[PDB]
Amino acid sequence: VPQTVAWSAKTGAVMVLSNILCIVAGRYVIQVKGSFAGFGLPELLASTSLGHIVGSGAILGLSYVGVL
Amino acid sequence: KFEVSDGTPYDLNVPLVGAASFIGWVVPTLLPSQIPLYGGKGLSTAFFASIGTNLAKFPAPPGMTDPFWLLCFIWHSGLFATMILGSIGYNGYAA
Amino acid sequence: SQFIKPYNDDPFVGNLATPVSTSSFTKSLLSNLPAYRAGLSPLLRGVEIGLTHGYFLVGPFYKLGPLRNSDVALLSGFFSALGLIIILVACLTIYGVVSFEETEAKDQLQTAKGWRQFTSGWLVGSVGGASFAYILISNIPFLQTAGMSML
Amino acid sequence: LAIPFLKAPANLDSSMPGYAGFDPLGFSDNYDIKWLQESELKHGRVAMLGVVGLLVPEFVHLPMYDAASTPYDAYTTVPAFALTQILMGCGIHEFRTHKGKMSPDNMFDDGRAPGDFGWGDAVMATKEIKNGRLAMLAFGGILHQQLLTKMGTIAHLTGGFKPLEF
Amino acid sequence: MFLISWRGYWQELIETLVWAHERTPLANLVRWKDKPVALSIVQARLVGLIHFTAGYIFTYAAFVIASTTGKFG
Amino acid sequence: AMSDSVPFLKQPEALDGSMAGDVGFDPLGFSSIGDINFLREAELKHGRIAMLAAAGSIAQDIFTFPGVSKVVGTAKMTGVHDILVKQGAMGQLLLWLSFLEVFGTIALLETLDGKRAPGDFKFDPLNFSKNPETFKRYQLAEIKNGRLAMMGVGGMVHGYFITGKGPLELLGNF
Amino acid sequence: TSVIGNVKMTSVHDTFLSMEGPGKGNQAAMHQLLLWLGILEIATSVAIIQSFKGETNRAPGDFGFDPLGFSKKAGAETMALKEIKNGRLAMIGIGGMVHHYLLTGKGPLQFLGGIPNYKSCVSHPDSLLPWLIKPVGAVLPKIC
Ligand code: CLA
Ligand code: CLA
Ligand code: CLA
Ligand code: CLA
Ligand code: CLA
Ligand SMILES: CC1=C(C#C/C(C)=C/C=C/C(C)=C/C=C/C=C(C)/C=C/C=C(\C)C#CC2=C(C)C[C@@H](O)CC2(C)C)C(C)(C)C[C@H](O)C1
Ligand SMILES: CC1=C(C#C/C(C)=C/C=C/C(C)=C/C=C/C=C(C)/C=C/C=C(\C)C#CC2=C(C)C[C@@H](O)CC2(C)C)C(C)(C)C[C@H](O)C1
Ligand SMILES: CC1=C(C#C/C(C)=C/C=C/C(C)=C/C=C/C=C(C)/C=C/C=C(C)/C=C/C2=C(C)CCCC2(C)C)C(C)(C)C[C@H](O)C1
Ligand SMILES: CC1=CCCC(C)(C)[C@H]1/C=C/C(C)=C/C=C/C(C)=C/C=C/C=C(C)/C=C/C=C(C)/C=C/C1=C(C)CCCC1(C)C
């Protein structure tokens, strides 16, 4: 079984970083919606949902490879 | 002046597409893995080592359970995918 | 950038100009084949085509025939190839008899005299190519075992 | 002029600070030049700060934290909420030094130059660009050596200087 | 096959084959003297009847001779 | 009409005689299939690599750098490669030559457009070729020594495969 | 003779080839000859193809090989006749000498000096086409 870790501040840091990266990426690449003008609740929900998806994948992968 | 059709001159860009696709497929596949198929090496390096091992045993072909066939199939599959995508990107966009 | 165009710039003919059909590689290969290469008499077209086809005809008969496990496997395979060559020459002859009218023109394949010249060249080339394959397999042990002599 | 056997970059001029005619790939021909110069200056300044931040923690330490043996290792031993706070503070500083126009085609529309934030010769700009360009590669070297040897930079240089392997 | 499938399907297949032979290099040098067509309706009924009848006769003849030979001879 | 190197063959169409070392030698007609500039850039790269390999085979027979004999022992030529794949020297060489050859690939893109002479990397720091006549003489000498070096490296490595000695030791212990 | 022994005319080809090949032996004499002659013959093939189609007005058999300038000498207008005549004569002569070695095993000079060659036949190995000498015993007299 691949090693997963208990919740810590590192897990929170990775999740927060992935969420913020996905929020900025969603600001830049979403075609149909000063830089945060037009920023609405569905776009925030989509970006934070991708942020949990990317953060979960990154946390599981870094726990797999030993970076924790 | 290679015509790809009756009256359609087209640049195949075989040197660039071949070189760029080879480098862009080989370099990511230098990532090592500890599985016995790779033997501690990357996919490209395990493939090259298997080539050397089986060329050291000429006439005698690699056996069915030998990792050469799986390494060759995966490496050439990824290489062909890279060559197709590189031909698409460079011949179409050109920028 | 379109790769498929109407054939011969004619949109109503029953053909399309495709990379497989009309590229530079395809045009060079087709124009350099002996059936289409310029400057050849029909007899020499027959000679080249017959040499190639009669040369490769020996192999399947030698390796897979009913006498393949006997010491006379190559002799039987060559004889079977020669019989197939004679049958195909008869086919060529009757095709030319029923297909062409007797005309003065003799420099083209699709004339009566031209087809007779092509048939003569194909017979001589097929016999020569089959005999060459027989000689090479008879004298080289690599060809007898299809490479297994190296093991 | 940097690479004489390749053609000169058409989107490059000697007026640009640190110009050497060095763009063999042609990033300037495909991306906005002002965006590239702004990114180069920010990567530069951040790498200069990182070069200093990988050297000085080897000798002095803040008592509020635990002294990591390697100055690169400090992100693994301090609380990670420190790093999250540094991220958020850097983000508000990006929002404040800019006017909220943190995107291409929003930047430079005030006639803003690439890299100026109102903190101050054009020989000085070249000095900036070169001392940031050097600091980027130097930072890469210092980080990867401190990661591979698990020891400080000056400790590596003065004592042992063993070859790095992984 | 000749009693269930009927003509127009086979005629359209033969049309595609005629196109293929006319457009194939090194084979369009060879030309038919008679145009290839599908078998006619009555002809196909007759040919299916002939194959059917021959199968009937040969199957039962083989069965009756071999069964009587195996049991008694 | 006829070639100079092979007098009984018609002169190749893609060979005008402008490139250095052009004696009309293309009996198989490879310049009619491939681009002449691509083939010339390949010829110069193979020849320059062969010049370095020939000089290196001779010098590695003559002397080794300090500390090399600790790692390689008595291994010579080809036998070094495997050993120094493990030590890491060949990896560093592969890395930096690949880095240079990325810009070499861009240079190949320049020469396939017709905007760059094949093999021209503008690398003359010492200004040996300041006279176009001396430049022509140096181009002829470069291509002749490159082809001779290709032959030489073939001979040296296959003589080492046969005897295991190396070039100069085979010249001495024959 | 330390490599191949006392074989004279066609058993040299056979003996060398018996000792030629990776694994089979150490010689490469006939293979080296085949390699360099095949390079020359491919370069000749291109010339034959060019002269056949008419792209070149070169004479048949002319390779431009006259380093000593005998064409610019006197009496060179009959050299082609002497070449073709001695060529045909050598064709017949080597056919003679090979079919003499296949029966007596001597070689040319011993065969010329040993005029009753069926009274003293040198023992020689069978050629690489031994089936062709099979009718000599049964069908033919087999004087030797
Ligand atoms: C910090 C970044 C990070 C890191 C280090 C990793 C690391 C890893 N991830 Mg992970 N991941 C990340 C971010 C990261 N991930 C993110 C952001 C996401 C998005 C949520 C994911 C989503 C993800 C999934 C969903 C899975 C991983 C898995 C893995 C492990 C892969 C094991 C392996 O060899 O692959 C396997 C290598 C293969 C070659 C297998 C082939 C896989 C399928 C069967 C083939 C499908 C391809 C198909 C044929 C189509 C191709 C045809 C084409 C021509 C069209 C590895 C430890 C896997 C895992 O945890 O396994 C235990 C896994 O299932 N990752
Ligand atoms: C396998 C490697 C690979 C991949 C994934 C891409 C992908 C891409 N290239 Mg690209 N490229 C490659 C190799 C590759 N390239 C090489 C080798 C060259 C040099 C010859 C180029 C030169 C090139 C140019 C010059 C340009 C691109 C562009 C693009 C983008 C849009 C055009 C396109 O092909 O979309 C392909 C779309 C997808 C891949 C996404 C769909 C996903 C599905 C599942 C298909 C993917 C198949 C499969 C999963 C791939 C597996 C890869 C394999 C190695 C494992 C896209 C992101 C253009 C662009 O706008 O980008 C800047 C552009 O201008 N490329
Ligand atoms: C907007 C203003 C603001 C505020 C209110 C804070 C507040 C805080 N920062 Mg912070 N910071 C800011 C701006 C701000 N920051 C900026 C602009 C930057 C630069 C980008 C930073 C960079 C930064 C770093 C790098 C670090 C902090 C840390 C901290 C925490 C210190 C207390 C602690 O460790 O207990 C933890 C506090 C909580 C769990 C929640 C607060 C609950 C109460 C108030 C705690 C009381 C603690 C008390 C003061 C001291 C207890 C020990 C005492 C006996 C000595 C605290 C929550 C440190 C930290 O996160 O440590 C964990 C740390 O290392 N900050
Ligand atoms: C090599 C160091 C160096 C140099 C020469 C400059 C030079 C310049 N910077 Mg700059 N900068 C640097 C480092 C440097 N910076 C670093 C590390 C950061 C990140 C904190 C910044 C962040 C920054 C911003 C945000 C801005 C500038 C700007 C400017 C320009 C102001 C014009 C002016 O008033 O002229 C007079 C210039 C000077 C007198 C230069 C002062 C630099 C002194 C010499 C450095 C002192 C060295 C000293 C040892 C420091 C101790 C550090 C030690 C602990 C390691 C000028 C070209 C502004 C500009 O117009 O953008 C281009 C601007 O908006 N810089
Ligand atoms: C094809 C070229 C080639 C290759 C692959 C090798 C490979 C090798 N050499 Mg060798 N060598 C070469 C050429 C080559 N050599 C040349 C040309 C010489 C000098 C005549 C030497 C002299 C030499 C010695 C003395 C030793 C090696 C050794 C080695 C081994 C370890 C690497 C090392 O320390 O190299 C060191 C080699 C050098 C420092 C020579 C560098 C010369 C450069 C390449 C000349 C070109 C510079 C040029 C002006 C700039 C180009 C600009 C660019 C834009 C084109 C390795 C197997 C060592 C070993 O293991 O011995 C068995 C060792 O002790 N080499
Ligand atoms: C361009 C640039 C310059 C640069 C430069 C570069 C560095 C130029 C350096 C060049 C050298 C490397 C040329 C090497 C040629 C080697 C061949 C010809 C000899 C081959 C041996 C054969 C005959 C053999 C072998 C034989 C057989 C096979 C096996 C053996 O048993 C025996 C034997 C040995 C006899 C400089 C720096 C000056 C500056 C300038 O401003 C511009
Ligand atoms: C091109 C030209 C030149 C060239 C040249 C050189 C290479 C010319 C080389 C020439 C060869 C050697 C001429 C050989 C002729 C052989 C025939 C006539 C005799 C045949 C045997 C007879 C029939 C017999 C037999 C007999 C019977 C059968 C059986 C036996 O028992 C007895 C016996 C043996 C008597 C050079 C290089 C100078 C340069 C110049 O610028 C260009
Ligand atoms: C090396 C090697 C081998 C070999 C071999 C070789 C080299 C064998 C033999 C080769 C050749 C070329 C034989 C030629 C025979 C020529 C004849 C009979 C000519 C008759 C001419 C006449 C009658 C002319 C008549 C005439 C004509 C036309 C014109 C008028 C005058 C007149 C005289 C009437 C093997 C096979 C042993 C195998 C071994 O493993 C390897
Ligand atoms: C492999 C290759 C790679 C993949 C793609 C690919 C292209 C499809 C594929 C090719 C497969 C195919 C296409 C390979 C190509 C194949 C063909 C079958 C080769 C035929 C050669 C015929 C020669 C040798 C006979 C020559 C005549 C000799 C000299 C005769 C002398 C005779 C004359 C009459 C005079 C009398 C003496 C005798 C002896 C009787």
DSSP of F7-35, one letter per residue?
TTSBPPTT--S-STT-S---TT-HHHHS-
Alpha carbons A39 and D52: distance in angstroms, whole number = 38
Task: Let me know: does B32 contact B41? Beta carbons within 8 Å.
Answer: yes
- Tell me which H or E stretch contains D43: helix D33-53
Task: Let me know: does C124 contact C53? Beta carbons within 8 Å.
Answer: no
Give the number of residues written for chain C.
Answer: 151
Angle between helices D124-149 and D33-53 (to 10 degrees): 50
Chain C contact present for E15, CB below 8 A: no
- Tell me which H or E stretch contains G79: helix G79-104
Q: Which long-range contacts (CB under 8 A, 24 or more apart) does B80-89 make?
A: B82/B21, B82/B22, B82/B24, B82/B25, B83/B17, B83/B18, B83/B21, B85/B21, B86/B17, B86/B20, B86/B21, B86/B24, B87/B13, B87/B17, B87/B21
Alpha carbons C118 and C91: distance in angstroms, whole number = 13
**What are the CA-CA distances from residue C13 to residues C16, E23, E27, E36, F6 (Å)?**
8, 11, 19, 20, 49
User: Going by C-beta distance under 8 Å and a sequence separation of 6 or more, which residues neighbour residue D29?
Assistant: B95, D9, D10, D11, D23
3-state secondary structure B15-58: HHHHHHHHHHHHCHHHCCCCCCCCCCCCHHHHHHHHHHHHHCCC
Reported as half-sphere exposure (CB side, CA atoms, 13 A), residue F151 has a value of 6
User: Going by C-beta distance under 8 Å and a sequence separation of 6 or more, which residues neighbour residue D137?
Assistant: none
Alpha carbons D118 and G76: distance in angstroms, whole number = 97
Alpha carbons G136 and G126: distance in angstroms, whole number = 13
Burial (CB count <10 Å: 0-12, 13-18, 19+), residue E12 = exposed
Phi-psi region of A2 (alpha: psi -120 to 50; beta: other; left: phi over 0): beta
Alpha carbons D3 and F107: distance in angstroms, whole number = 10
**Method by which the model was determined:** cryo-EM
Token pair 């050596």 is at which residue? D145
Alpha carbons F88 and F78: distance in angstroms, whole number = 15
**Mutation test residue for ligand 4: of D34, D39, D119, the one with most atoms within 8 Å of CB:** D119
| Residues linked to residue F122 through DSSP beta bridges, in sequence order | none
**What are the CA-CA distances from residue C149 to residues B89, C65, F96, F157, G31 (Å)?**
48, 21, 45, 29, 19
- Tell me which H or E stretch contains C5: strand C5-6
Token pair 């190749």 is at which residue? F12
- Nearest C-alpha of chain B: how many angstroms from C93? 36
Token output for G66: 């006259």
Q: What is the rounded radius of gyration, in angstroms, for the C-alpha atoms of chain E?
A: 20
Alpha carbons G50 and B38: distance in angstroms, whole number = 53
Residue D84: alpha-carbon gap to chain centroid: 20
Taking alpha carbons only, the member of C59, C82, C57 closest to residue C144 is C59
Task: Let me know: does D136 contact A65? Beta carbons within 8 Å.
Answer: no
User: Going by C-beta distance under 8 Å and a sequence separation of 6 or more, which residues neighbour residue F78?
Assistant: F157, F160, F161
Ligand 9 contact via C100 beta carbon (within 6 Å): no
Task: Let me know: does B87 contact B14? Beta carbons within 8 Å.
Answer: no
Task: Let me know: does C134 contact C56? Beta carbons within 8 Å.
Answer: no
**What are the CA-CA distances from residue G16 to residues G76, G106, G123 (Å)?**
40, 19, 19
Alpha carbons A55 and B65: distance in angstroms, whole number = 39
Q: Which long-range contacts (CB under 8 A, 24 or more apart) does C67-74 make?
A: C74/C134, C74/C137, C74/C138, C74/C144
Alpha carbons E37 and E17: distance in angstroms, whole number = 10
Taking alpha carbons only, the member of E2, E5, E14 closest to residue E46 is E2
Inter-chain residue contact G43 with F27, CB threshold 8 Å: yes
DSSP class of D7: P
Burial (CB count <10 Å: 0-12, 13-18, 19+), residue F40 = buried
Alpha carbons D36 and D22: distance in angstroms, whole number = 13
Token output for D105: 């085609």
Ligand 5 contact via F62 beta carbon (within 6 Å): no
Q: F110: which chain D residues are within 8 Å (Cβ-Cβ)?
A: 5-7
- 3-state helix, strand, coil split of chain D in percent (to 5) is 45, 0, 55
**What are the CA-CA distances from residue C55 to residues C74, C75, C124, C151 (Å)?**
13, 14, 12, 26
Alpha carbons F155 and F150: distance in angstroms, whole number = 9
Ligand 5 contact via F174 beta carbon (within 6 Å): no
Token output for E32: 């038919």
Counts for chain D of helices (H) and strands (E), in that order: 4, 0
- Resolution, given in Å to one decimal, reads 2.1
Give the number of residues written for chain D.
Answer: 166
Chain F contact present for B20, CB below 8 A: yes
**What are the CA-CA distances from residue A64 to residues A57, F92, G62, G119 (Å)?**
10, 30, 76, 93
- Nearest C-alpha of chain F: how many angstroms from B73? 25
Which one of the ligands is nearest to D114 CA? Answer: 4
Alpha carbons D51 and D55: distance in angstroms, whole number = 7
Task: Let me know: does C46 contact C120? Beta carbons within 8 Å.
Answer: yes
Q: In chain F, which residue's Cα lies nearest the Cα of G26?
A: F162
Alpha carbons D15 and D33: distance in angstroms, whole number = 13
Alpha carbons F8 and F13: distance in angstroms, whole number = 15
Alpha carbons C82 and C74: distance in angstroms, whole number = 12
Is the pair B, C in contact (3+ CB pairs within 8 Å)?
yes
Q: Number of C to E CB contacts under 8 A, please give it.
A: 16
Between the CA atoms of G110, G114, G120 and G121, what dihedral angle is there, to the nearest 10 degrees? Answer: 40
DSSP class of F3: -
Give the number of residues written for chain B.
Answer: 95
Chain E contact present for C101, CB below 8 A: no
DSSP class of D9: P
Alpha carbons F22 and F72: distance in angstroms, whole number = 42
Would you list the DSSP string of E20-68? Answer: HHHHSTTTTTS--SS---PPPHHHHHHHHHHHHHHHHHHHHHHHHHHHH
Task: Let me know: does E26 contact C49? Beta carbons within 8 Å.
Answer: no
Chain F contact present for G41, CB below 8 A: no
Of B5, B58, B92, the CB nearest to C22: B5
User: Going by C-beta distance under 8 Å and a sequence separation of 6 or more, which residues neighbour residue G38?
Assistant: none
Burial (CB count <10 Å: 0-12, 13-18, 19+), residue D71 = buried
Alpha carbons F70 and C38: distance in angstroms, whole number = 68
| Residues linked to residue C16 through DSSP beta bridges, in sequence order | C6
- Tell me which H or E stretch contains C16: strand C16-17
Q: G42: which chain F residues are within 8 Å (Cβ-Cβ)?
A: 27-28
Interface of B with C (CB under 8 A): 1-8, 10, 58-60, 92
**What are the CA-CA distances from residue E21 to residues C27, D83, E16 (Å)?**
19, 74, 9
Task: Let me know: does B42 contact B32? Beta carbons within 8 Å.
Answer: yes
Q: In chain C, which residue's Cα lies nearest the Cα of E31?
A: C99
Task: Let me know: does F24 contact F3? Beta carbons within 8 Å.
Answer: yes
G44-63 burial, b if ≥16 CB within 10 A, otherwise e? bebbeeebeeeebebeeeee
Would you list the DSSP string of C17-37? Answer: E-HHHHSHHHHHHHHHSTTT-
Inter-chain residue contact F108 with B15, CB threshold 8 Å: yes
